[PDB]
Symmetry: C2
Subunit: 56 residues, 2 copies
């Protein structure tokens, strides 16, 4: 009983794991002047940000 | 007489000076995750490249 409240809920993990993954990707290309297809993550990094709270 | 051939003509200077100026700008924003308006230079850095020969 009360399984979701047995461990913890600091973050959704999956989402938080994806955000830190896409943001760290921009630096790579942006550093190698490959931000063309890389900077696009800016749209997913910003949208996933607000969802951080709506998620957990 | 022969003024354009008195000094030299390694490069157009103005163009070559602008290209190195726009390309060095991308690294700045791209490094501070500001490639949004910065990555746009990619269009001027690539177009000015081919013009490098058509110029001098």
């Amino acid at each position: 009983l009360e399984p979701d409240n047995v461990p913890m809920d600091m973050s959704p993990k999956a989402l938080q794991q994806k955000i830190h993954e896409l943001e760290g990707l921009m630096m790579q290309h942006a550093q190698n002047l490959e931000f063309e297809e890389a900077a696009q993550i800016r749209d997913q990094l910003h949208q996933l940000r607000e969802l951080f709270i709506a998620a957990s």
